[PDB]
Every structure is written in structure tokens, then in C-alpha cells.
Amino acid sequence: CNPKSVLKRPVTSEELLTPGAPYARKTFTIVGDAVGWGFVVRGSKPCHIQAVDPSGPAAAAGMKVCQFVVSVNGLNVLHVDYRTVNNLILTGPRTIVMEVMEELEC
């Protein structure tokens, strides 16, 4: 009851590591706002984006829900817990450099 989950794919860690897949990597830099960025990551191994505020700054600069991240502000976070990534982004600067898997409608 407590968790909801969004993405249909159960696990995509191994497929993400493999070079052969429809996804094309993209790096997104998000600037802070007066009330927050407005994105949540709740993926255990891949740390996929859980939800994005449609009116938030993240939604303006792409950052769709169906995405996966591997590195934040330079540091590679491809294999860590979601809670640890949340600690890293908060302790970092207001502007966050993020990499989005951005699956090509697959």
C-alpha cells in the first residue's frame, strides 16, 4: 500500500550497462528554484525518476518521468541506493548536473 511504482520495466540495470539498447544518454543541468527543483528518484538499483512536478523547473527542461540516472554533479551513482542519491543531491550545490537515460519510446 505504501509504495506505488510507475515504470513498467521491473529491472533495467543490466540492459542499461550493455551498449546495445535504444536509449540515448543525455546530460541535464537543473537550476534551483525558490521552493525546490521538484523531482523524486525512488529506484533501488538504477535510481529511476519517480515523479516530476509539471510546473516545476525540471519539467521545463525535459526531465520526463520515464528516465534513469547514472551520474549526479560529475560523481557516478550508477549503482547505489535511492536514499543515498537523495542525500548527495541535497548536500550538493543548488544547480545539479544530471544524466538522463531517456529511453527512445521503447
Binding site for another protein (CB under 8 A): 1-4, 32-36, 38-40, 42, 50-56, 90-91, 93-94
The distance of closest approach from Cβ of residue 51 to another protein in the complex, given in angstroms and rounded to an integer, is 5
The distance of closest approach from Cβ of residue 38 to another protein in the complex, given in angstroms and rounded to an integer, is 5
Between 36 and 62, CB nearer to another protein:
36
The distance of closest approach from Cβ of residue 99 to another protein in the complex, given in angstroms and rounded to an integer, is 14
Between 15 and 53, CB nearer to another protein:
53
Between 17 and 75, CB nearer to another protein:
75
The distance of closest approach from Cβ of residue 96 to another protein in the complex, given in angstroms and rounded to an integer, is 11
- Work out the angle at residue 63's Cα, subtended by the Cα atoms of residues 77 and 5, and round it to the nearest 5 degrees: 75
Between 13 and 50, CB nearer to another protein:
50
Q: Where are the beta strands (DSSP E) in 2-91?
A: 26-30, 39-41, 49-52, 71-72, 75-76
Residues after which a C–N gap over 2.5 Å breaks the chain: none
Q: Which helix (H) or strand (E) holds 27?
A: strand 26-30
C-alpha cell, 41: 528518484
C-alpha span between 18 and 47 (Å, rounded): 17
